[PDB]
């Protein structure tokens, strides 16, 4: 038993991290087969950063403007192209450590592991959710750009996030591996703000089920509710509406615990209205919303 915010084992991604330097700018890249993926703002200097024209900056570069370092080795860049906000550097050597992999664009509310990296060297690994406002609450410093987020299924790595920037609120923004930003953000140092966030309701419910699986039951009640009355309460507390799709996704957990989904919604409703009153759930005094139902099933088995 026990329930932890658990990341995927990171070795298959560690094998893929490289350093990309253009001019005086160094960040991380992802080396898969004979291609290195990295944020395009590697071709920026610090005063190109308020309003760069990336096409202009890139037409003024050649292959030999880019240095790729894979641990000891230097990789010769033999081609370069831009796809949305990512640069693709074709190198003369296929990564011998390339895992089975996919690129995926995830939906808000889904979780993934981030491998925080600096100068091509992994620093740490932690679990994240894509917030409803398409930011992530990460841990990123200067030089971390190009760090990626991923899920692992069997032994195939689904890459879903590459890190590009930090918003004034301390939260983080980035792209899929095709270079399309999550959310409305753009890669320039202009005034940008995240939209109002909300709490991921289906995930909170999944975590309450994890609590029950692990023997935290003080929050259950004999009550129930309809989806609509629950959603009235949820709107009041800045929770996302609960869809019948969500209720169905919660099916297997409801079945393992014998607690109907709408019964657990009644428990969440009274948790929202009363608070915790000095008690904790799975070691948290807040309602946690960065575990999907699939995370709960995976970890609780």
């Amino acid at each position: 038993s026990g329930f932890r915010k658990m990341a995927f084992p990171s070795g298959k991604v560690e094998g893929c991290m490289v350093q990309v330097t253009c001019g005086t700018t160094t960040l991380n890249g992802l080396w898969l087969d004979d291609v290195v993926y990295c944020p395009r703002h590697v071709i920026c200097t610090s005063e190109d950063m308020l309003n760069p024209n990336y096409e202009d900056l890139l037409i003024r570069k050649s292959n030999h403007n880019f240095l790729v370092q894979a641990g000891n080795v230097q990789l010769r860049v033999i081609g370069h192209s831009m796809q949305n906000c990512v640069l693709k550097l074709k190198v003369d050597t296929a990564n011998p450590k390339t895992p089975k992999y996919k690129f995926v664009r995830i939906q808000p509310g889904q979780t993934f592991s981030v491998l925080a990296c600096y100068n091509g060297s992994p620093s740490g690994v932690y679990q994240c959710a894509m917030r409803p406002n398409f930011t992530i609450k990460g841990s990123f410093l200067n030089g971390s750009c190009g760090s990626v987020g991923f899920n692992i299924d069997y032994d195939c790595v689904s890459f879903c996030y590459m890190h590009h920037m930090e918003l004034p609120t301390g939260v983080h923004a980035g792209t899929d591996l095709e270079g399309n930003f999550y959310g409305p953000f753009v890669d320039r140092q202009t005034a940008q703000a995240a939209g109002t966030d909300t709490t991921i309701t289906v995930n909170v419910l999944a975590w309450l089920y994890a609590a029950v699986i692990n023997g935290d039951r003080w929050f259950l009640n004999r009550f129930t509710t309809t989806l609509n009355d629950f959603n009235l309460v949820a709107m009041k507390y800045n929770y996302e509406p609960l869809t019948q799709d969500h209720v169905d996704i919660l099916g297997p957990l409801s079945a393992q615990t014998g607690i109907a989904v709408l019964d657990m919604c009644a428990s969440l409703k009274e948790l929202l209205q009363n608070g915790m009153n000095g008690r904790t759930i799975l070691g948290s005094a807040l309602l946690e919303d960065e575990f999907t139902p699939f995370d709960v099933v995976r970890q609780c088995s």
Binding site: P39, M49, S144, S147, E166, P168, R188, Q189, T190, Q192
Partner: peptide, 5 residues
């Protein structure tokens, strides 16, 4: 300000 990492 957004800040590129």
């Amino acid at each position: 300000x957004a800040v590129l990492x």
